[PDB]
Design a protein around this nucleic acid. Structure first.
Lengths: 82, 69, 75, 106, 135, 65, 78, 82, 70, 81
RNA sequence: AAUUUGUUACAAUACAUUUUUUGGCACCGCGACCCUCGCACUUGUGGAGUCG
C-alpha cells in the first residue's frame, strides 16, 4: 500500500535526487523519514548548466524532493512486499 | 485546535492584507479556527467598495492590521 | 459573533449577487448566486459570470469553484 | 494462477509468419530465451525499455517493426557475448568468430 | 605545538561580537575546521608565512596580530605587529579584500607605503583604519 | 503511460507503484521538456532506468492505447 | 562532520540552512520539530542579490519548516 | 509538542522581529502566540521588501505566511530547554 | 438544497470542462471522489479556448483544479 | 570594559564595530549606538582585564577614521561581564 | 582477604481537501559640506544639497 515503507526499505543507496527547484543531488541515502525527508551522505549538488558544489551531509525536506532517481540494479517486486 | 484570539479586534475596522499584494478594509463581525474572517463591508485598496458584508477565506490572509487602536 | 459557515448558509438561503475573488489571481473574478455548501470553503454557484478586473463582461455557465482557490465572498 | 491440472495452448510467434520465416522466427526465439536463461531482468529491460510499445492481449513478445526487431536482435545477441566475457573472464577481442557464433547459437 | 587536527578540535568555538575559531609556527591542517568558520583568530602565535590554507569558502576574516609574518603566499585581513619589511612583499595581496591592516610592520615606514598599497591593492577600501580616498 | 507535471515535464514511463498521494515508482522512464533561454527553440528528452516520483508534481496522467 | 542517522542526534551543531526564497540561515540547532521548524542559537541570514554575499546577523531565531529547503553542517560543536 | 512553539510563547512580552513570505520584516512586542504561529504584536515597525519603513500599532500575522522569527538573546539562557 | 458533492455525483457520465492553476479541458466524466480528483474520457485540451490536442482517457489531480463546468 | 569617545560618527554602525573589533583584537579577546546621546562612542569589552589596561595605554589618541580616539575605563561593569 | 526479579516516571515503534510535508510552481548607499563631545546594551538614527 504505502510508498513510505518502500522508501524506508531503500537504505544505503547512492542516488540522484531532483527538487521542485530543479537541483540535481548525487548522494547516499542513509535514511528517510515517514514524511519523505531525505538524509544523504557523500553528497554532490549540481544545477540543471553551471558548476558543482559537494557536501558531506545533507538533510533535504520531503516537500522539496520532486523525483528520487533510483539506483541501477533494483528488485522492485520484492521491495513492494509487506 | 485553539481559537485565534481576535476578540480584541471584534467590531473594529481592520486592514486585511490579503494574498497577491492586495488589501481589504472593514469592521470585524466574526471568525473561526481556520482564521476565516466575516466583516461588514469596505473598499479594496484609488478606492471602491463592493458588497454590504464580506467573508475572507483563512488561507488568503497575510495580515489583519488594526486600523482602530 | 457571526461564523463563516453561518454566513454562507444565510447567503444560500437568500440567493443574492455574490462576487468571488480568486486566490493568487488578480485579473479574474467570478459573479453569481450561491447554491451549494461544503465542510470546506468549496461551493456550487449556478449562473456564474467570469470578470476581467479594471486595472467588461464575458460568457460563463453554471460552475462549482473549488474551495482552495476562493478568496472573497459578499452576499 | 492455475490451481488445477489442465492443457493450455499459446502462440510463440504472435504473428511473425507474415514478415518473418519460421526458421528465423524460431532462431530469434532461441536467442531471446537464452538471454532469458542468462541475463533475466536486463533482457526484460530491453523489452520494456520503451513502454510506449506494449505487449498485446493475445500475444507474448511486444510488437516492434522490422528495423526494431533487428536492432533488438543485435542487443539481445550481444548480451550473451557480454555475459560470456564477464563470468568466463575471456575478453571478446581475443576470440575467434567460430566461438562467438557457437556460443550465440549455444 | 604544531597546528594539528586534534588542536583545532578542542579549540574554543563561538559566535563573535560571525562564526569564529580561537587559535604555532606553521599554518597547516585547516581541513579539519571543515570550512565552518567566518573568522579565524591566529593572534599571538609564531607563524612566519601567511600560506598553507586548504580551500576555505566560508573564511572571511583573518586576525593575525602579533605573529612573525615576513612573507605572504577573504574580506578582512589584520596583520598588525608582524615582520613585513619590503613593499614588494605585500604584492601577493593584489590577487585577493576590503579591510586591510598592516600597522606596526617595518614596511610602514617605507617611502610611499600607503600609495603603493592603494595602487597595487585597489580593492582595499579601508587601509590601516583610514578610508582609502579618491585623492 | 504519459504524465503531465507542474514544471512542464511530460513523463512517458512504465508505472510500478501507486498510493493515496499519487506518488509513483517508475521504470522505462522518458521525460520531455525544453531547456530554452529566450528567444530559443529546443526539444530535449532523456532516458532513465528507474525513478521515484512525488505526487504534487502530477497534474494529469493519461493512457495512450 | 560525523556520519549521523537523524537530525535529532546532531543537536547543537553549527548549521547551514537553505530556504525557498534563496536565503541561507547559518547557526547552531538548539531545537527541532515534528514539522522541521528550527531554533537557531546564533543565526546569520546570508543572502545573494542578482553578485556577492550580503550578510545579516539575527540572533536567536525560530525558523519555520515550510520555508526550509535543506540543512547542511557548517562545523563541529562549541 | 513543538519546542520552537514553546520558545515563541515564552518570547511573549519581548520585542521579537518577524519576516514573512512577502519579505516584509516587522519588529515589536509579542502580544500573543498560538500553536500555529499566529502572532500578534504591539508598537510595530514594518519594513517593505524594497526598503521603506512604516510605523503601525497592533499587527496580527498568520504563521502560514510567516518565514522566520527573531527572539531576544536572553531567552537562550533559560528555562525551556532544560 | 443542492450541495456540491451530490451535484458532482450526478454529473458522472456527462460532459465537463476543467481550468487549472492555466489551461482549459473538455471531456466526459468517468467518476469522482471526496478529494475532488477526476477521471475523464475523450479529453480535449483547450489551451485558452484552443483545442490543442485530444488525449482521450485521462486522470486529473485535484490540487491543480480551478473549476468544473458544462 | 573601555569607553571610547571622539569617534568619527559618519562611519556606519556595523563597519565601526568591525574595525573596532579588528583594532582591539591585538590586545586580547574582545556596544555602540548611533542615537543622538550615544553617537561617537563605544564600549569595548575584553575577557581579560590586563588586555583592557594595555589597550587603554597603547591606543590613547590613536587616529581612527581621521580622529584621535579618547579612551577611558567605563564607569560601571558591563552586563555581559 | 556486577547480575537477576518487582514497582513508578520519560522517550521511540497511521496517512493527502485553508496554518507547516501533497506546495501557486514556472516561463539605504557613494562625492561634497557642517552639526553633536555625549558612560551604554540597540528595528533605524545629524542636518542641507547632489548622485544612484
Amino acid at each position: 500500500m504505502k510508498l513510505v515503507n518502500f522508501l524506508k526499505k531503500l537504505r544505503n543507496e547512492q542516488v540522484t535526487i531532483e527538487l521542485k527547484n530543479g537541483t540535481t543531488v548525487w548522494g547516499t541515502l542513509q535514511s528517510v523519514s515517514p514524511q519523505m525527508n531525505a538524509i544523504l551522505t557523500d553528497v554532490k549538488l549540481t544545477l540543471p548548466s553551471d558548476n558543482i558544489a559537494s557536501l558531506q551531509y545533507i538533510n533535504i525536506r520531503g516537500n522539496t524532493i520532486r523525483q528520487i532517481i533510483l539506483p541501477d540494479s533494483l528488485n522492485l517486486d520484492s521491495l513492494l512486499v509487506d | 485546535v485553539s481559537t485565534p484570539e481576535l476578540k480584541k479586534y471584534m467590531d473594529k475596522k481592520i486592514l486585511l492584507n490579503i494574498n497577491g499584494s492586495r488589501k481589504v478594509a472593514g469592521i470585524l463581525r466574526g471568525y473561526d479556527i481556520f482564521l476565516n474572517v466575516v466583516l461588514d463591508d469596505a473598499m479594496e485598496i484609488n478606492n471602491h467598495q463592493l458588497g454590504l458584508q464580506t467573508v475572507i477565506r483563512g488561507n488568503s490572509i497575510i495580515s489583519l492590521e488594526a486600523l482602530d487602536a | 459573533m457571526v461564523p463563516p459557515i453561518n454566513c454562507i448558509f444565510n447567503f444560500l438561503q437568500q440567493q443574492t449577487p455574490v462576487t468571488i475573488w480568486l486566490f493568487e489571481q488578480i485579473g479574474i473574478r467570478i459573479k453569481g448566486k450561491i447554491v451549494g455548501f461544503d465542510e470546506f470553503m468549496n461551493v456550487v454557484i449556478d449562473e456564474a459570470v467570469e470578470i476581467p478586473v479594471n486595472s467588461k463582461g464575458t460568457p460563463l455557465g453554471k460552475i462549482l469553484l473549488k474551495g482552495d482557490n476562493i478568496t472573497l465572498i459578499t452576499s | 494462477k492455475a490451481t488445477e491440472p489442465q492443457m493450455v495452448l499459446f502462440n510463440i510467434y504472435d504473428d511473425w509468419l507474415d514478415r518473418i520465416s519460421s526458421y528465423t522466427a524460431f532462431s530469434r526465439l532461441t536467442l531471446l530465451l537464452r538471454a532469458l536463461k542468462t541475463n533475466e531482468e536486463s533482457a526484460k529491460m530491453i523489452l520494456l525499455s520503451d513502454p510506449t510499445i506494449t505487449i498485446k492481449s493475445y500475444h507474448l513478445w511486444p510488437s516492434f517493426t522490422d528495423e526494431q526487431w533487428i536492432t533488438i536482435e543485435s542487443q539481445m545477441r550481444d548480451l550473451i557475448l557480454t555475459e560470456y566475457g564477464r563470468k568466463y573472464n575471456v575478453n571478446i577481442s581475443a576470440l575467434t568468430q567460430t566461438e562467438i557464433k557457437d556460443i550465440i547459437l549455444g | 605545538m604544531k597546528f594539528t587536527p586534534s588542536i583545532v578540535i578542542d579549540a574554543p568555538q563561538y559566535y563573535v561580537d560571525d562564526l569564529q575559531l580561537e587559535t604555532e609556527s606553521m599554518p597547516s591542517s585547516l581541513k579539519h575546521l571543515t570550512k565552518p568558520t567566518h573568522i579565524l583568530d591566529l593572534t599571538n602565535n609564531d607563524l612566519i608565512m601567511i600560506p598553507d590554507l586548504s580551500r576555505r569558502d566560508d573564511i572571511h576574516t583573518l586576525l593575525l596580530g602579533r605573529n612573525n609574518i615576513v612573507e605572504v603566499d577573504v574580506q578582512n585581513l589584520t596583520l598588525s605587529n608582524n615582520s613585513i619589511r619590503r613593499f614588494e612583499d605585500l604584492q601577493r595581496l593584489r590577487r585577493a579584500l576590503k579591510n586591510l591592516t598592516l600597522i606596526g610592520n617595518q614596511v610602514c615606514h617605507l617611502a610611499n607605503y600607503r600609495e603603493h598599497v592603494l595602487r597595487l591593492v585597489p580593492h582595499l577600501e579601508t587601509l590601516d583604519f583610514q578610508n582609502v580616498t579618491a585623492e | 503511460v504519459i504524465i503531465s507535471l507542474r514544471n512542464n515535464h511530460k513523463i512517458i514511463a512504465r508505472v510500478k507503484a501507486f498510493d493515496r498521494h499519487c506518488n509513483m515508482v517508475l521504470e522505462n522512464v522518458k521525460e520531455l521538456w525544453t531547456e530554452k533561454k529566450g528567444k530559443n527553440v529546443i526539444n530535449r528528452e532523456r532516458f532513465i532506468s528507474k525513478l521515484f516520483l512525488r505526487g504534487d508534481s502530477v497534474i494529469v496522467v493519461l493512457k495512450t492505447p | 562532520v560525523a556520519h549521523s542517522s537523524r537530525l535529532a542526534n546532531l543537536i547543537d551543531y553549527k548549521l547551514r540552512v537553505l530556504t525557498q526564497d534563496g536565503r541561507v540561515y547559518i547557526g547552531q540547532l538548539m531545537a527541532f520539530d515534528k514539522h522541521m521548524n528550527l531554533v537557531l542559537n546564533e543565526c546569520i541570514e546570508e543572502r545573494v542579490p542578482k553578485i556577492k554575499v550580503e550578510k545579516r546577523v539575527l540572533g536567536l531565531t525560530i525558523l519555520r519548516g515550510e520555508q526550509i529547503l535543506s540543512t547542511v553542517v557548517e562545523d563541529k560543536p562549541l | 509538542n513543538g519546542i520552537p512553539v514553546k520558545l515563541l510563547n515564552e518570547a511573549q512580552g519581548h520585542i521579537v522581529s518577524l519576516e514573512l513570505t512577502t519579505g516584509a520584516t516587522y519588529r515589536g512586542k509579542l502580544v500573543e502566540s498560538e500553536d500555529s504561529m499566529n502572532v500578534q504584536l504591539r508598537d510595530v515597525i514594518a519594513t517593505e521588501p524594497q526598503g521603506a519603513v512604516t510605523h503601525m500599532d497592533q499587527i496580527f500575522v498568520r504563521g502560514s505566511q510567516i518565514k522566520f522569527i527573531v527572539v531576544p538573546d536572553l531567552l537562550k539562557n533559560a528555562p525551556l530547554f532544560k | 438544497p443542492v450541495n456540491p458533492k451530490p451535484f458532482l455525483k450526478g454529473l458522472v457520465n456527462h460532459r465537463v470542462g476543467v481550468k487549472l492553476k492555466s489551461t482549459e479541458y473538455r471531456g466526459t466524466l468517468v467518476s469522482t471522489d471526496n478529494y475532488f480528483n477526476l477521471q475523464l474520457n475523450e479529453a480535449e485540451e483547450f489551451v485558452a479556448g484552443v483545442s490543442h490536442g485530444t488525449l482521450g482517457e485521462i486522470f486529473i489531480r485535484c490540487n491543480n483544479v480551478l473549476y468544473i463546468r458544462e | 570594559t573601555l569607553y571610547v569617545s571622539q569617534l568619527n560618527e559618519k562611519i556606519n554602525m556595523q563597519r565601526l564595530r568591525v574595525n573596532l573589533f579588528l583594532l582591539f583584537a591585538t590586545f586580547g579577546e574582545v556596544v555602540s549606538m548611533n542615537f543622538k546621546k550615544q553617537r561617537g562612542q563605544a564600549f569595548i569589552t575584553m575577557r581579560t582585564i590586563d588586555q583592557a589596561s594595555l589597550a587603554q595605554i597603547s591606543l590613547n589618541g590613536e587616529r581612527f577614521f581621521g580622529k584621535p580616539l579618547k579612551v577611558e575605563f567605563s564607569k560601571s561593569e558591563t552586563k555581559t561581564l
